[PDB]
Nucleic acid binder design. Structure first.
Ligand SMILES: [Mg+2]
Ligand SMILES: [Mg+2]
Ligand SMILES: [Mg+2]
Length: 155
RNA sequence: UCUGAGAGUUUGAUCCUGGCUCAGGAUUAACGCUGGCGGCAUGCCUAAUACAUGCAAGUCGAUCGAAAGUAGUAAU
């Protein structure tokens, strides 16, 4: 049940020897709401083929996401170009405090309660890149225990 | 035990810097349209401009002389 949702449908174009070639570009986010989510941007002369190619790319590039108590473990800032997205853990009940591309990414990934803020640009592809970078840079509290020879997150 | 949502807009199309605008609240508010009632609360932000009129700090005869009125033949 890999649900998908459309984030942006731009109308890009080039110029030829007389006239303009117009193609639709779609930014699709595919997620199973259990820990797998990817993104795919595709261009085609028509919306259906563009959506098909974007879904194919999103399913080709899937990333693994780990959740702690339905939320993100520690506060992080994802950077990608001029877009910086701040994610912050939330207690169970606040729900998704995200809006737009971040909200799409978080819901399709499976997180329940996240605090988010877009501190930079508002271009959906770069916001998605920053969000994915922030979630991917995350550290589990068992990898750090293995690294520092602590006792499975014990004090 | 706190705790933060964004979008539109420069280009044939894209990224960034960057300004403008909107989505939310609030008032000692005013205006247009309309208008049934009750519980609380507020009501010259301007001319510290000028004011008709009527009220807004008096009380004590158990401090004191006197005076007036009502009763009483008088004293009282
Ligand atoms: Mg020619
Ligand atoms: Mg234009
Ligand atoms: Mg005044």
């Amino acid at each position: 049940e890999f649900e998908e949702r459309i984030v942006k449908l731009k109308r890009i174009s080039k110029t030829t020897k007389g006239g303009r070639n117009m193609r639709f570009s779609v930014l699709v986010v595919v997620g199973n709401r259990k820990g797998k989510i990817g993104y795919g941007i595709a261009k085609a002369l028509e919306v259906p083929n563009a959506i098909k190619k974007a879904i194919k790319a999103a399913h080709n590039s899937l990333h693994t996401i780990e959740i702690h108590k339905g939320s993100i473990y520690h506060e992080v800032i994802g950077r990608s170009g001029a877009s910086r997205v701040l994610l912050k853990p939330a207690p169970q009940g606040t729900g998704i405090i995200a809006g737009g591309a971040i909200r799409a990414i978080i819901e399709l990934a499976g997180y329940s309660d996240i605090y988010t803020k877009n501190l930079g640009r508002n271009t959906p592809i770069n916001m998605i890149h920053a969000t994915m970078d922030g979630i991917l840079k995350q550290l589990s509290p068992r990898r750090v225990a293995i690294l520092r020879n602590k006792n499975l997150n014990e004090l």
